[PDB]
């Protein structure tokens, strides 16, 4: 149970919920066919924002995670909630109106299982920071940035995987082109994916991270 509550970009750490469509409730999405998968919603209604955060292309941003909106650095997520972390971008005409539901998404970050250490565990232990590299080669303009943590502690059953995501409203600044291939959310995940329907208690130090291949600048 966790929420992407604030974003650091270009040397500024913005306030809780600034530019981020945060739910007040920290519960999971478990149906990967739901439109709620894009930017949360449904059982976790989100709070609208009229703010857009400036982000330099080619820079690293930091998605900061907390158990609840007012939690501190020792209360990111239950350490049992082992799984991957991921991040996606979608180019949008207007970050104040686009719901993120549908096509246009591309993966820009993923952290799976590395010699016994899960991506979520690293975010928990490093103070709730998920590090995300914004591609250098993409066009300026408005985007949604979707950051995600997936807990797999109950994932050996269908729809047992727990997905926690929020969308930040950003304006990317600074030879440019979008990726050739983009994807739909919902669409990228299926309940039978080998990284979602999985028994993590039988792994020794390959985990197949769900979703499309990460975009790399050409
Ligand atoms: C995810 O899928 C790959 C096959 O591409 C496997 O290496 C892995 O065990 C998991 O099933
Ligand atoms: C660009 O290249 C890197 C590997 O060097 C991948 O992480 C990415 O998926 C894309 O192929
Ligand atoms: Cu939880
Ligand atoms: Li490409």
UniProtKB/Swiss-Prot annotation:
Free-text remark on how the cofactor is bound: Binds 1 copper ion per subunit.
Cofactor: Cu(2+)
Catalytic activity, reaction form: [(1->4)-beta-D-glucosyl]n+m + reduced acceptor + O2 = 4-dehydro-beta-D-glucosyl-[(1->4)-beta-D-glucosyl]n-1 + [(1->4)-beta-D-glucosyl]m + acceptor + H2O
Binding site for Cu(2+): 1, 81
Biotech use, per record: Lignocellulose is the most abundant polymeric composite on Earth and is a recalcitrant but promising renewable substrate for industrial biotechnology applications. Together with cellobiose dehydrogenases (CDHs) an enzymatic system capable of oxidative cellulose cleavage is formed, which increases the efficiency of cellulases and put LPMOs at focus of biofuel research.
Biological process (GO), any one: cellulose catabolic process
One Gene Ontology MF term: monooxygenase activity
UniProt KW Chloroplast keyword: no
Recorded domain comment: Has a modular structure: an endo-beta-1,4-glucanase catalytic module at the N-terminus, a linker rich in serines and threonines, and a C-terminal carbohydrate-binding module (CBM). The CBM domain is essential for binding to and subsequent oxidative degradation of polysaccharide substrate.
Family (UniProt): Belongs to the polysaccharide monooxygenase AA9 family.
Annotated function: Lytic polysaccharide monooxygenase (LPMO) that depolymerizes crystalline and amorphous polysaccharides via the oxidation of scissile alpha- or beta-(1-4)-glycosidic bonds, yielding C4 oxidation products. Catalysis by LPMOs requires the reduction of the active-site copper from Cu(II) to Cu(I) by a reducing agent and H(2)O(2) or O(2) as a cosubstrate. Active on tamarind xyloglucan and konjac glucomannan.
Name by which UniProt lists this protein: AA9 family lytic polysaccharide monooxygenase A
Annotated gene: gh61-1
Shown part of the complete sequence: 16 to 238 of 322
């Amino acid at each position: 149970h966790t929420i992407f509550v604030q974003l650091e970009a270009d040397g500024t750490t913005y306030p809780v919920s600034y530019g981020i469509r945060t739910p007040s409730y920290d519960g999971p999405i478990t149906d990967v066919t739901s439109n709620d998968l894009a930017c949360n919603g449904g059982p976790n209604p989100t709070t609208p924002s009229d703010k857009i955060i400036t982000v330099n292309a080619g820079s690293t941003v930091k998605a900061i995670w907390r158990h609840t909106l007012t939690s501190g650095a020792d209360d990111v997520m239950d350490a049992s909630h082992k799984g991957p972390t991921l991040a996606y971008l979608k180019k949008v005409d207007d970050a104040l109106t686009d719901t993120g539901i549908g096509g246009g998404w591309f993966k820009i970050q993923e952290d799976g299982y590395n010699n016994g250490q899960w991506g979520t565990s690293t975010v928990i232990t490093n103070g709730g920071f998920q590090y995300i590299d914004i591609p250098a080669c993409i066009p300026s303009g408005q985007y949604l940035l979707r950051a995600e943590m997936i807990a797999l502690h109950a994932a050996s059953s269908t729809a047992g995987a727990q997905l926690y995501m929020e969308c930040a409203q950003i304006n990317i600044v600074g030879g440019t082109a979008l990726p050739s291939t983009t994807y739909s959310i919902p669409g990228i995940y299926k309940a039978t994916d080998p990284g979602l329907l999985v028994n993590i208690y039988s792994m020794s130090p390959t985990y197949t991270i769900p979703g499309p291949a990460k975009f790399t600048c050409p």
